[PDB]
Coordinates of N, CA, C and O in Angstrom, one line a residue:
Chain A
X1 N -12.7 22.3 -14.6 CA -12.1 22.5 -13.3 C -12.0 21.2 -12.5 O -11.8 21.0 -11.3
X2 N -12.4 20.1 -13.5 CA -13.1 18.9 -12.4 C -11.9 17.7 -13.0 O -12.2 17.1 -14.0
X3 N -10.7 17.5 -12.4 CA -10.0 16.5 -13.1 C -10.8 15.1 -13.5 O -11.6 14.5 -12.8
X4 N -10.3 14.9 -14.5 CA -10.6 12.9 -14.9 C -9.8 11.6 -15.1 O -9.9 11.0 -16.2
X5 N -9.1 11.1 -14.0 CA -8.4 10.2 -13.7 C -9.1 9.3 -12.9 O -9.6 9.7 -11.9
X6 N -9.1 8.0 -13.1 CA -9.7 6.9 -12.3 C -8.9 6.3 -11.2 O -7.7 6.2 -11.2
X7 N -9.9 5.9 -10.1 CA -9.3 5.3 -9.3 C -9.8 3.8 -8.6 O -10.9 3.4 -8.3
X8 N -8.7 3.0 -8.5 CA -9.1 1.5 -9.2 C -8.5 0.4 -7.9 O -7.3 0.8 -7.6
X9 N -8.9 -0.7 -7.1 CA -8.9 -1.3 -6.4 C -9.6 -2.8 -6.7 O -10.2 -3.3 -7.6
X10 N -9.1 -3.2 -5.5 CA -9.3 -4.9 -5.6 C -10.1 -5.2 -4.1 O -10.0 -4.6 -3.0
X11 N -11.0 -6.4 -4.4 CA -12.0 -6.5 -3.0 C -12.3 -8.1 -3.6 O -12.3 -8.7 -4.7
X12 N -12.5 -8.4 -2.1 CA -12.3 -9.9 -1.6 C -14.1 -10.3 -1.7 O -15.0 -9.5 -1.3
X13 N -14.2 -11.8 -2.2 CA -15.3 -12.3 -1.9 C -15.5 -13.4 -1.3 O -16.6 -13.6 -0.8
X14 N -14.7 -14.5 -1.3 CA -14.8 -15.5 -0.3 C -13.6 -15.7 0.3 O -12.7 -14.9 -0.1
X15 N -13.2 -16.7 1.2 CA -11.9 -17.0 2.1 C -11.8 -18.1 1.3 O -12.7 -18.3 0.5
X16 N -10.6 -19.1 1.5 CA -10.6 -20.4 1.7 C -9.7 -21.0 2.3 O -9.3 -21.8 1.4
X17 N -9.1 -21.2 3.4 CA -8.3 -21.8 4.2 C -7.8 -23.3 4.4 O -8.7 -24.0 4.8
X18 N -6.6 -23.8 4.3 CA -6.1 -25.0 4.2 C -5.2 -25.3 4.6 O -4.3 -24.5 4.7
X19 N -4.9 -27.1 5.2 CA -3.6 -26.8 6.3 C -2.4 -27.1 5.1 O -1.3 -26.7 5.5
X20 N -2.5 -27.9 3.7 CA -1.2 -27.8 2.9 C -1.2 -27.3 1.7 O -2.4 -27.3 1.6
X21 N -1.0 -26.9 0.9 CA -0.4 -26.0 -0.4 C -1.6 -27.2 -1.4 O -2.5 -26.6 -2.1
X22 N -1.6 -28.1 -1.5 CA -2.4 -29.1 -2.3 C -3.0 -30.0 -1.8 O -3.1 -31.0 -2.4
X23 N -3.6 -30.0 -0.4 CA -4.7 -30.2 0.9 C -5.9 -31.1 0.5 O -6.3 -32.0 1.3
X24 N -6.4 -31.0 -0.5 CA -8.1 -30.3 -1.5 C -8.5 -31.7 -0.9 O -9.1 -31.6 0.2
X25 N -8.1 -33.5 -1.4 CA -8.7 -34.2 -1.6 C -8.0 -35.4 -0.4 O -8.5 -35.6 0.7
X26 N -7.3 -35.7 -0.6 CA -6.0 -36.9 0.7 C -5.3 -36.2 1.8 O -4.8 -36.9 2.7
X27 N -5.2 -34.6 1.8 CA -3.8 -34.8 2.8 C -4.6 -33.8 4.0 O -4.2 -32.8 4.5
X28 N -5.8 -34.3 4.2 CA -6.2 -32.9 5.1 C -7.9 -31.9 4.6 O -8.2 -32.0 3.4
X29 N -8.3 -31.4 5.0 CA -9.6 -30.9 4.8 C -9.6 -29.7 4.9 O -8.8 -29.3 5.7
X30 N -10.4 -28.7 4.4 CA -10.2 -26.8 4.1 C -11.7 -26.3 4.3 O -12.7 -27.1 4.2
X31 N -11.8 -25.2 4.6 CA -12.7 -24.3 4.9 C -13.0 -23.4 4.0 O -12.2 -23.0 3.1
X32 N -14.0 -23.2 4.0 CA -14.9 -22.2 2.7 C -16.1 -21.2 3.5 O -17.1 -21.5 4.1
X33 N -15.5 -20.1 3.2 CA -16.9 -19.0 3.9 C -17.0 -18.0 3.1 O -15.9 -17.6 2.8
X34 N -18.2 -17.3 2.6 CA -18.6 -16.0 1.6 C -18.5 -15.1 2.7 O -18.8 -15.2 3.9
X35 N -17.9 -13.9 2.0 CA -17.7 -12.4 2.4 C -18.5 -11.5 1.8 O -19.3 -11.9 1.0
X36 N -18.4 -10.2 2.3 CA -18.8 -9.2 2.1 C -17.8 -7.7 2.1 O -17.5 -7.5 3.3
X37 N -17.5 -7.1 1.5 CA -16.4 -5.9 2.0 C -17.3 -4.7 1.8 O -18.5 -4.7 1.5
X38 N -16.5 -3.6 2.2 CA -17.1 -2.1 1.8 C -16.0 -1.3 1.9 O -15.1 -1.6 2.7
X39 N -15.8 -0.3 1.3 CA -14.8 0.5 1.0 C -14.2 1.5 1.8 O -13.0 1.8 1.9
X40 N -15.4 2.2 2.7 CA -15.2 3.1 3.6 C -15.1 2.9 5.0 O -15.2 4.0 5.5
X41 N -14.9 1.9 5.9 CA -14.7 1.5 7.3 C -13.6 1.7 7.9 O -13.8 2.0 9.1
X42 N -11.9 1.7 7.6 CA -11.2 2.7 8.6 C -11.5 4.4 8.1 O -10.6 5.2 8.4
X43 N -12.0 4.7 7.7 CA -12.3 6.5 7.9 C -13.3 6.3 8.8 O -13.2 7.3 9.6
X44 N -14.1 5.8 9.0 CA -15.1 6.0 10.5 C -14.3 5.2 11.7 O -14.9 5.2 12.8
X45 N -13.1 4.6 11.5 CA -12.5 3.8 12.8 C -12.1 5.0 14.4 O -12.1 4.7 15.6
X46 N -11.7 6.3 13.5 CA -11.1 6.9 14.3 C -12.2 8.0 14.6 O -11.8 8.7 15.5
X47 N -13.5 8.3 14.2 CA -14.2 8.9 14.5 C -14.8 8.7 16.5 O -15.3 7.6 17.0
X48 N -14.6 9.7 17.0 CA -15.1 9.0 18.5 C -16.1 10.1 19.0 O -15.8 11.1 19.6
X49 N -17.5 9.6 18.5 CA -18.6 10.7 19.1 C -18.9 11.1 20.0 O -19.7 12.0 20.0
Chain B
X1 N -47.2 -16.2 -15.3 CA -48.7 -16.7 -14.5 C -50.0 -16.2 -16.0 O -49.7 -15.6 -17.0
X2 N -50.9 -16.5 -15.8 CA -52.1 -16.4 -16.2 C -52.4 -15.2 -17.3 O -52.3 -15.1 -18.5
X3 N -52.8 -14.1 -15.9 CA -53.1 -12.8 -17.2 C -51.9 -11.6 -16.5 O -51.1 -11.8 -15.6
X4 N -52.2 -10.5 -17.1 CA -51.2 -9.5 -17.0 C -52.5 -8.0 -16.6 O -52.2 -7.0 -15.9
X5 N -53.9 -8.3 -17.2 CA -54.3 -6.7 -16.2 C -53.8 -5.5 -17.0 O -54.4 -4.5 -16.7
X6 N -53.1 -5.3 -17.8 CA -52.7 -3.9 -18.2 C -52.0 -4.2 -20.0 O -52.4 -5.2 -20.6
X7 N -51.3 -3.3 -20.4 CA -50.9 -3.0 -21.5 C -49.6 -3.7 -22.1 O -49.2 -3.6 -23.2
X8 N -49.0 -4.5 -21.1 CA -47.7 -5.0 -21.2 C -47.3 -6.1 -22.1 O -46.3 -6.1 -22.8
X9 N -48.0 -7.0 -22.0 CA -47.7 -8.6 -22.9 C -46.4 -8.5 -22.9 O -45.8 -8.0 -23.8
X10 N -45.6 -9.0 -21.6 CA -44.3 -8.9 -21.5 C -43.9 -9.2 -20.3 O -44.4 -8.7 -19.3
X11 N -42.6 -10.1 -20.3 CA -42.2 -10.7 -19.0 C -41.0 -10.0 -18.6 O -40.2 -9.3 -19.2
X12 N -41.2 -10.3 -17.3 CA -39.6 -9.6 -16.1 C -38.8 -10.8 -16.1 O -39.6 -11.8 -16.0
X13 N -37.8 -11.1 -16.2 CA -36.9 -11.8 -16.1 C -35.7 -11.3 -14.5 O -35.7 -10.2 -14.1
X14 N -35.1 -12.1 -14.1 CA -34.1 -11.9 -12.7 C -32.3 -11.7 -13.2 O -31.3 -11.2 -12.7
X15 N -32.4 -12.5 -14.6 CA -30.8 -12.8 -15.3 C -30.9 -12.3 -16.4 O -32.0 -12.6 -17.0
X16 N -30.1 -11.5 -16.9 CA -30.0 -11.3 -18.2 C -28.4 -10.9 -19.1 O -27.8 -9.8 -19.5
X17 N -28.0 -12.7 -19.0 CA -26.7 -13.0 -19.5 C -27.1 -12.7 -21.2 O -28.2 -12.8 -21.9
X18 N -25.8 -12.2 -21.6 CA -25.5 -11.8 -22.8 C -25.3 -13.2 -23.7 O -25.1 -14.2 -23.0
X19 N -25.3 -13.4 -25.1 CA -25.4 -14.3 -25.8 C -23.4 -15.3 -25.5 O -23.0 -16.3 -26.1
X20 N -22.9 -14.6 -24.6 CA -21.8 -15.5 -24.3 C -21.8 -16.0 -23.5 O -20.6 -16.2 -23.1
X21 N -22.8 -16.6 -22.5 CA -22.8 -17.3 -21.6 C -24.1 -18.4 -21.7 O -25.3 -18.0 -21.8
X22 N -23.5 -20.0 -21.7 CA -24.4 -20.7 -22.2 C -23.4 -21.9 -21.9 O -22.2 -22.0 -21.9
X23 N -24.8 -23.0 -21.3 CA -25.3 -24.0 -20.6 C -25.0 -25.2 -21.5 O -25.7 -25.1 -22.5
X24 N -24.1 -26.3 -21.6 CA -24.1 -27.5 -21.9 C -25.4 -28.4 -21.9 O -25.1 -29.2 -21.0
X25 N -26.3 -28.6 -22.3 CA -27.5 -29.7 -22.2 C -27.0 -31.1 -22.5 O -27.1 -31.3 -23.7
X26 N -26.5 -32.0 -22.1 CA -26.4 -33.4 -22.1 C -27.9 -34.1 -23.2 O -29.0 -33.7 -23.2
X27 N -27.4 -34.9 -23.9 CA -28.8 -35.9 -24.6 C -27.9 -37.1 -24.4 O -26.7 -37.1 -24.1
X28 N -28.8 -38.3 -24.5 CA -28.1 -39.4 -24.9 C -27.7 -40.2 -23.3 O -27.3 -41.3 -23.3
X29 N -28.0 -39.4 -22.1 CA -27.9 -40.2 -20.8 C -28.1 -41.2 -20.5 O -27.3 -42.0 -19.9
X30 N -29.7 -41.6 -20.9 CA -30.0 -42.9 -21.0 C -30.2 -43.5 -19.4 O -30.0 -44.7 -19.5
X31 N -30.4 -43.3 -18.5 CA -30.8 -43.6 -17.1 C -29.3 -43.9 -16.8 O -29.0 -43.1 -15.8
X32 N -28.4 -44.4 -17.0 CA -27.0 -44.4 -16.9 C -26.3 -43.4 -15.8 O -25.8 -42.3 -16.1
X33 N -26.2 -43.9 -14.7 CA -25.8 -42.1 -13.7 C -23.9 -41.7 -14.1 O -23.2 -42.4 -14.8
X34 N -23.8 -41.1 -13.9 CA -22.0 -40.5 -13.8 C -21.4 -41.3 -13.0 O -20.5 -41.9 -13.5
X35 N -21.6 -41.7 -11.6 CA -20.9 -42.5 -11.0 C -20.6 -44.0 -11.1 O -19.6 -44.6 -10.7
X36 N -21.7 -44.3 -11.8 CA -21.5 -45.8 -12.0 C -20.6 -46.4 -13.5 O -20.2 -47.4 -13.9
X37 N -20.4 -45.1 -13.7 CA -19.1 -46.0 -14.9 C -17.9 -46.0 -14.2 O -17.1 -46.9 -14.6
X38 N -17.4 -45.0 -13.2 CA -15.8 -44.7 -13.0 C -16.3 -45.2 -11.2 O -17.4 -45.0 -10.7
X39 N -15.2 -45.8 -10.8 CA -14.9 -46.4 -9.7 C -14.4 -45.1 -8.6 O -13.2 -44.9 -8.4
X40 N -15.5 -44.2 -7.8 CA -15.0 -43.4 -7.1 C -15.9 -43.6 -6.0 O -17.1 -43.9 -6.2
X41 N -15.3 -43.4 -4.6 CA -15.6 -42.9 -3.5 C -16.2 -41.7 -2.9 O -16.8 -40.8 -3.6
X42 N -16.1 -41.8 -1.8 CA -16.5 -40.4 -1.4 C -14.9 -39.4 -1.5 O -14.9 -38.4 -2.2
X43 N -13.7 -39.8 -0.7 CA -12.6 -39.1 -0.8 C -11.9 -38.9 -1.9 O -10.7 -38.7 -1.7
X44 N -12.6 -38.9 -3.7 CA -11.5 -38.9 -4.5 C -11.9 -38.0 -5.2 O -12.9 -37.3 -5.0
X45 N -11.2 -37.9 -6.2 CA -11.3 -36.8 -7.3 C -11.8 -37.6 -8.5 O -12.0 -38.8 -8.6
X46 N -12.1 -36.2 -10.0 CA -12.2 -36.9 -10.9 C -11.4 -35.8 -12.3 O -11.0 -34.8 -11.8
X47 N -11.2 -35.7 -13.6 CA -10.8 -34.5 -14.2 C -11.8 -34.4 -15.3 O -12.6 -35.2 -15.8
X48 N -11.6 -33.5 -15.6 CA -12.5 -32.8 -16.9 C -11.6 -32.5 -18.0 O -10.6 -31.8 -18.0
X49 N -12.1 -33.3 -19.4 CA -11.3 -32.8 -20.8 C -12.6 -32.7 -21.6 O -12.6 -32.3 -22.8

């Protein structure tokens, strides 16, 4: 009674932001920060206790 | 450390990579550093073959 089909997604672990397409070393300087995600945060968005 | 206290003769480890992941060891350095053979700065790059 219990179906078995998977369910499958994608999750982010760092950023890295830059002001040109190939930035890295001469044309400008980039940002780097580690993340964290979680799966379930808009289903509690709309909750209002 | 020292002694173990119980029945174990056996260590905890924190990593436990599978036989496909493994470390390059360098011999032959020779006090010789990386930077002093190739003519680089602080703003440049370098490539790997």
């Amino acid at each position: 009674l219990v179906a078995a089909y998977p369910i499958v997604g994608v999750g982010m672990e760092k950023l890295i932001i830059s002001t040109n397409e190939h930035a890295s070393t001469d044309q400008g300087k980039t940002v780097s920060r580690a993340t964290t995600n979680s799966k379930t945060e808009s289903n509690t968005a709309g909750v209002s206790v | 450390n020292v002694g173990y206290q119980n029945g174990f003769t056996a260590n905890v480890t924190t990593n436990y990579s599978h036989t496909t992941d493994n470390s390059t060891a360098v011999q032959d350095s020779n006090g010789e550093s990386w930077n002093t053979g190739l003519s680089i700065n602080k703003g440049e790059s370098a490539y790997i073959n």
